[model samples]
Target chain A: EGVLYVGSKTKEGVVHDVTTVAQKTKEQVTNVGGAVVTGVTAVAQKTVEGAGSIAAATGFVKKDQL
Target chain B: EGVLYVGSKTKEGVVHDVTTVAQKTKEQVTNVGGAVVTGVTAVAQKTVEGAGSIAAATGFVKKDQL
Candidate 1:
């Protein structure tokens, strides 16, 4: 929960782990930013109503069985 | 830039990449949260002054040549 430990028994493996995590996290955050932009755009354009629709359109809704 | 692509040529490698990223990100966020708590506690205790010192104590300062 604090520091991630690499199981690979090599320096290259540890480097790969850190590099991969950094890159993937960047990509994930970028997508989340894009989703926020999408939600904002929807609100600005008056195309979607209410908070729920905006969240859904941005793929932020987690309550399934809706 | 978008979705993170796994260079591993197998399903296990892809899973490893995703699982590693998820775990590492969780750990990193936890540490940042800890750092925030540290800064807030320092401020609350009157042990530090100014925003810059708080950020520095929390390892948030990036200007290395100071």
Candidate 2:
């Protein structure tokens, strides 16, 4: 599944996964000072395949579901 | 005053109103493929009036303040 994941660091020094309700991937990229890469799904799938449950344990959500 | 109110939809399809600073009203719900709805202030005022103290407890800040 090509799911977009977004994480952010707050001005208060807290790093947390924002609720999908809170921001879009582009907004997340802007806040994090990074560019949005199109290949995130391939990378995530590879990681999940290689890492198995560990990848799932990372708590990333599916793009459509998150 | 016809202030522009904005909100957004995420990849996960969660919709939330974003701050004017973070995202213009045109930008927020734009991601969700929805047109900006005018006359939000009137709706807000009516809702606030109907809810009374509970509305005050919702913790939403005023526009210029948040």
Candidate 3:
């Protein structure tokens, strides 16, 4: 597909949450960074299992695959 | 717009991939599962392209308009 396949895996929440933080960076980068990046890491955790599955299935990991 | 007008298009490499896998799995679920339900291979293929596009776009997907 294009690059992301675009939306195969959409939490929509991450986008909203990050953007929330991103948009507010004008106020405090640290504040937004804290919550949003935490969320990012939280979001990161969601895909760990999926990473294991896909890694096992395809055996093609471009990077950490974490 | 809030739902995910999202980035027009982005490809951070499957959100660094499981985000890639989950993105792919969920996509396949929608895709293969849908194909199973509809019995239209052509439609499914197009849908896959669309799905991938969204997944790629999601890499930069930050809610409405960043």
Model 2 lDDT per residue over B1-66, tens place? 332323422232112232222322333222122112211110111111222122211112222211
DockQ for the candidate 2 complex?
0.02
Error of 1 at A33 (Å): 18
Candidate-wise lDDT, in order: 0.21, 0.21, 0.21
Q: Give lDDT tens digits, candidate 1, residues B1-66.
A: 333333422122111111222222222222221112211111112122233232112222122332
lDDT of 1 at A2: 43
Q: How accurate locally is residue A64 in candidate 2, as Cα lDDT from 0 to 100? A: 28
**Model 2, residue A65: what's the lDDT?**
21
Q: State the TM-score, rounded to 2 decimals, of chain A in model 1.
A: 0.16
Model 3 Cα lDDT, one tens digit per residue, A1-66 = 233333454432122122212112122222211112112221221222222122111111122222
- Residue-level lDDT of model 2, residues A1-66, one tens digit each, is 343324532122112232221222442212122122211110111111222122211112122221
TM-score of 1: 0.14
Q: Ranking by DockQ, best first? A: 1, 3, 2
- Taking chain B only, the TM-score of every model is 0.16, 0.14, 0.13
For residues B1-66, what per-residue lDDT tens digits would candidate 3 score against the true structure?
Answer: 123433454322122222211111121212211111211001001112222122211112122322
In model 3, state the lDDT of residue B37.
20
Rank by TM-score, highest first.
1, 3, 2
| Highest DockQ scorer | 1
Docking quality category of candidate 2 according to DockQ thresholds: incorrect
